[PDB]
Structures are given as C-alpha cells and as structure tokens.
Amino acid sequence: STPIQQLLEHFLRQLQRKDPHGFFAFPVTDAIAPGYSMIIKHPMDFGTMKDKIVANEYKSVTEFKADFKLMCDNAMTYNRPDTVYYKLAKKILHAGFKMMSK
C-alpha cells in the first residue's frame, strides 16, 4: 500500500459515512433505475472507487476527486431535483470537496 492509496482509503471511508443508506455503495442497475445505462455514459459509485484504489488506478488526489464528482454529477443528471437521490448527491458533493480540502 502506497501513501496515496492510504490517503484515498481514508477519504473514501469519510465520504461513505455521508451515505448511511448506501445509495452510492454499488453500481446502479437498470432494474432499480429504468434506462440508467443508456442515459449515463460513465457510471461511478463508491464500490468501484474502492476497487480502483486497491488496483492502484488513482495516481493523484485530483484523479480520485474527479471520480467522486462524476458519481455525484451522474446522480444530478439522471434524477429530478425533488428526489432523495438528487438531494443527497448535491449535499455530499459539496461536503465531500470541503472535507478533502481542509
């Protein structure tokens, strides 16, 4: 485990605490979200992010933050603003970037 992997595991733990229902835990399936795979071209979720950390795919914090933002942006594209899923994505995007900067 490299120093970067250790830091990213720390950030990921802190980010996942902000999703207590686990809506972001695993890839979204079309059964749960009809037509999702044809609307969202670059899916992302915390489980995929964990696998990417362990596989050593993130070479910088910047690359990691971009996947986090992608995950939130996908949720704000697929879901309407008045939904639980949109609201959490907006909340966690802003809080997560703040947490990773302080």
Ligand SMILES: C=CCCn1cc(-c2cccc(C(=O)N(C)C)c2)c2cc[nH]c2c1=O
């Ligand atoms: C906020 C997260 C962004 C990703 N995400 C996830 C789900 C989702 C996945 C698995 C289980 C459930 C769930 O617990 N229920 C009750 C359906 C919900 C979902 C459903 C409609 N839109 C989305 C959506 O965008």
